[PDB]
Structures are given as C-alpha cells and as structure tokens.
Design a protein around this motif. Structure first.
Motif, mmCIF file in Angstrom:
data_model
loop_
_atom_site.group_PDB
_atom_site.id
_atom_site.type_symbol
_atom_site.label_atom_id
_atom_site.label_comp_id
_atom_site.label_asym_id
_atom_site.label_seq_id
_atom_site.Cartn_x
_atom_site.Cartn_y
_atom_site.Cartn_z
ATOM 1 N N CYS A 22 0.775 -1.210 -0.136
ATOM 2 C CA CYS A 22 -0.067 -0.051 0.006
ATOM 3 C C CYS A 22 1.020 1.132 0.076
ATOM 4 N N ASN A 24 0.209 3.983 1.470
ATOM 5 C CA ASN A 24 -0.742 5.103 1.654
ATOM 6 C C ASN A 24 -0.360 6.336 2.389
ATOM 7 N N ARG A 35 -6.786 3.827 3.354
ATOM 8 C CA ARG A 35 -7.074 3.110 2.331
ATOM 9 C C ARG A 35 -7.530 1.967 2.543
#
Ligand SMILES: [Zn+2]
Length: 45
Positions: A22, A24, A35
């Motif tokens: 990820c 994020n 997320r």
C-alpha cells in the motif's frame, strides 16, 4: 526505483501504511490506514 531516498515519500508526523504494498500517505492522527483501514503498526522491511 528512481531517486535514492533513505526516507520515504512522507514526513515525520505523517506516516504510510506498515506494508509496502500500500504505502498510502495517511492523514496523521490515523490509527488505521486511510485506504486499507489496517492498524498503525511497525511493520517488517
Ligand atoms: Zn494501507
């Protein structure tokens, strides 16, 4: 990847997901990903 950085694409207070899948850019006061919703953890390399 390009631009050899020892730091990530984030600052001191703001963090990114504990996993690199990820990564994020989370708000800041996030105990879970913005997320994923995964909990703020240390995470391996
Ligand atoms: Zn995430």
């Amino acid at each position: 990847g390009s631009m050899s950085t020892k730091n990530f694409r984030v600052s001191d207070g703001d963090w990114i997901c504990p996993d690199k899948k990820c990564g994020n850019v989370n708000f800041a006061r996030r105990t879970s990903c913005d997320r994923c919703g995964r909990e703020k953890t240390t995470g391996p390399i």
